[PDB]
Design a protein around this nucleic acid. Sequence first.
RNA 1: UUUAAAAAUUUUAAAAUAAUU
RNA 2: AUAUAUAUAUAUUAAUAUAUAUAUAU
RNA 3: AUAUAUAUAUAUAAAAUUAUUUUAAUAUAUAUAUAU
Length: 679
Amino acid sequence: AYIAVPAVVDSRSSEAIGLLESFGVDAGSDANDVSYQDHDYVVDQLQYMLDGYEAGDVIDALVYRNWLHHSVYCLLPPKSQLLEYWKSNPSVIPDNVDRRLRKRLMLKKDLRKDDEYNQLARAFKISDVYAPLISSTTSPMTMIQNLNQGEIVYTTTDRVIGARVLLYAPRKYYASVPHSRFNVGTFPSIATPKCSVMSGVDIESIPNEFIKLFYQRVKSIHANILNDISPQIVSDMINHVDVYRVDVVNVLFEVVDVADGLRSVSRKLIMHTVPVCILELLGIEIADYCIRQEDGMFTDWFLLLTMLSDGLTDRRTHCQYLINPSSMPPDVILNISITGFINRHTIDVMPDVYDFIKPIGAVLPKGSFKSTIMRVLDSISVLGVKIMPRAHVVDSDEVGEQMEPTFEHAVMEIYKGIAGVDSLDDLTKWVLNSDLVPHDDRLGQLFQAFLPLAKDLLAPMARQFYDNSMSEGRLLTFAHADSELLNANYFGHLLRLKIPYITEVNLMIRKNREGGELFQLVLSYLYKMYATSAQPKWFGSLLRLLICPWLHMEKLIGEADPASTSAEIGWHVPREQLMDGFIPYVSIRAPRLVIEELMEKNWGQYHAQVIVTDQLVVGEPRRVSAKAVIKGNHLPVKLISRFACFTLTSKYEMRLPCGHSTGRGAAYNARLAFRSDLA
RNA sequence: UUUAAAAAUUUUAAAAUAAUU
RNA sequence: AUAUAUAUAUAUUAAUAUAUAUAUAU
RNA sequence: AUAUAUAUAUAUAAAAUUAUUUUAAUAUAUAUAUAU
Ligand SMILES: [Mg+2]
């Protein structure tokens, strides 16, 4: 038998990870008959072969492979070096080769200029000697056919796909498996009657993007002849822990209005890739739930779910939904009822944009729940780590509040430029009519005045504020539009974000804000008009990274020794220059065997000017604030491998638990240095 | 009966000088 | 005695900054 | 923890349009002619 899965299957590691409990199969037992297959090199060959050929030809060829039929290529050097190898060590010559050619190669002459051997080599071709010879222009369908029928195939090129490539001659003449009745691996085929494909995982959620292309192309042409089997059917047929790889499903639920004992389904939705660990933690299963529980504010485990995922779309009309944040009708979600779970798979929580250790700027619209998400995020501290303290995050209003006329006060006086308004309430009435969605022309006349305030005041103030903030440690900073972080030249990762709710209603729900609620809302419209359209991309994309890796590591280092499983890596200054103390800058947490490996890495080729001060901090541990400015290069994440759970924010500060006296401050030209205990 | 029209192609890849965006 | 071209032959392949180790002194 | 001398290694400076000038021995030896 043979089964194909949407994932890169390997015979070494895929047994360790399993992949079958991954996709949701109950293979767990003394099964030892589901033998995997090596498709790493096959994916690499597919990528290399799409470079020259066409995707349709390559995929429609590779689909007709009999993966349970062992075979192999072996490439020949070109004709010249081939003949050189025929000559030297001549007792390997196939008998097809011409009698004259063999009789002339068996001679010990220099072969400098043999008048007849030159002709005999000119009229010699490789294709006649070795029978199955693929081509330099094979037009690959015969490649897969010849791999299907036979044991060895002879190529004169490297662009081949289907099996491994073996060398024919020694390296000089070139330039620079048992079955188990339940074989599995990627790349479905239709070679036999027993090839099956495991359904249950959507096509748009496949993460590899080459397996994804292969599946799309094969499933749009061979839909009616493929054998689909779900994870339950596969289960019935059968019957250095990596962090940042989490299992995700999505929840199927509908809205219910249980008034006076009469159930009434109202709407059906899909939560779109909440991670499985959070559903396990919160104890979510098939039952009814109330998602407010008091005073019309969400119960906040529901808020955590909605903020840890992508967004929910209606199942009737396949479009996004954006559930209502208020508690006023027409639409109010007060009671839901989860009904099932569909496609499960792993994803890489580490975004590709994040490779170096640097600050993070998360742009959100105005009316989002930034305050409540901060209140909910500052509490988590898994292994005594405090993954996101409240002091490491920069509020969105801070850069505008630090001005003599603050920014919002500066824009409140904008009604003087209009032809005639005479008051802020008349401005809010002249802009949007008797609901939101203001008049676009009037909003444009207002934006032409709002813009110079944002380009001439806010940008110059922010260009200094973000520098001052970057000096004193990594911080997670928010904003109301990417243009704020782009005009003011912001350093760090620029993550746009978005929330699954209607943010414009929060601007009416919240009361005690400067100016009327209508003014806050018009201000949000102006920021949204100053936005430079680009994909906001689902706020949960960040919170999933923030939370998920720690929960997994808590299973591995839940009970080990804190001294043996810990570390900290900061800027070092020698015991002199007191006219040793290091600023932390990072706090690693990982098993002992990886701390041993991190203990020996360089960590010293990274420099920065640390400027210690003499100011005291109200916090308990007696410590003095400091600063630091990296010079040359930034710490890449590869050093802190995928097996440790580090922190993303940190303040710069030094503790002084010896001879308490703060003298004069200074700059010292620190050097990075690993700092753990004995372990 | 002897003479003659002859091809005006490119975008010419790099290295130095000068002018410009 | 010098050089140029003619035929052949032969060999042949073409500023600043930083890091590391040695030594001497503190 | 540092200073000086030494040795080794590394990083840094672009694209386009226009016009002009230069890019088939490397060397020697024998036989031929010529010039100084
Ligand atoms: Mg210019």
